[PDB]
């Protein structure tokens, strides 16, 4: 069996959310072995802490980023980056706070 480099499938270019609300963005991907998922904003990794507002759920072919109680300072350019033993991929989405 053969490795497959990670490949992000569709990620939106721009998304918007009202202050104080929950935002969810889901993104599919492929790659073998299963790629490690990193979400980052302004070049700085997002840490999925169970005691906080940022939560990341990853499966074999899906990542979901959930931001609860969205603050004005949560806005910015978010990068999803994937890595396995055969390569990497990245895509950015611009998250706007209303």
């Amino acid at each position: 069996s053969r490795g497959i480099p990670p490949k992000i499938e569709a990620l939106p270019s721009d998304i918007s959310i009202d202050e104080g609300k929950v935002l969810t963005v889901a993104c599919a991907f492929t790659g073998e072995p299963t790629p490690e998922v990193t979400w980052s904003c302004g070049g700085r990794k997002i840490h999925s802490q169970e005691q906080g507002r940022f939560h990341i759920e990853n499966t074999d072919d899906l990542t979901t980023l959930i931001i609860m109680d969205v603050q004005k300072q949560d806005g910015g350019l978010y990068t999803l980056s994937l890595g396995n033993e055969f390569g990497s991929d990245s895509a950015t989405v611009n998250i706007h706070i209303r």
Binding site: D14, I15, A26
Partner: protein
């Protein structure tokens, strides 16, 4: 009450130019989320060959005949009082030689 989320995420479609293409997703949240579809940063409007059939949680984007000017990344945006959820899928349209 409960923000939007995807029970079933929209999958990529690869189609021959002139043939039918559909994206399907299943969206949960309370109250039931309103769903709209976007391309090129703009909300898509229904047309002669683009429609947006929905049956409860099941929301779809249907191109009766998919042409090369329809290829690209479609975004599904679900919305209710608690929040918004976004998911994308590529429609690829293949032109015969």
């Amino acid at each position: 009450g409960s923000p939007p989320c995807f029970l079933r995420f929209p999958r990529p479609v690869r189609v021959v130019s002139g043939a039918e293409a559909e994206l399907k997703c299943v969206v949960l949240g309370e109250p039931p989320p309103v769903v709209v579809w976007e391309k090129g940063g703009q909300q898509l409007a229904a047309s002669e060959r683009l429609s947006f059939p929905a049956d409860g949680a099941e929301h779809g984007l249907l191109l009766t005949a998919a042409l090369p000017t329809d290829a690209g990344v479609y975004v599904c945006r679900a919305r209710n009082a608690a929040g918004e959820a976004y998911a994308a899928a590529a429609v690829t349209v293949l032109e015969p030689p």
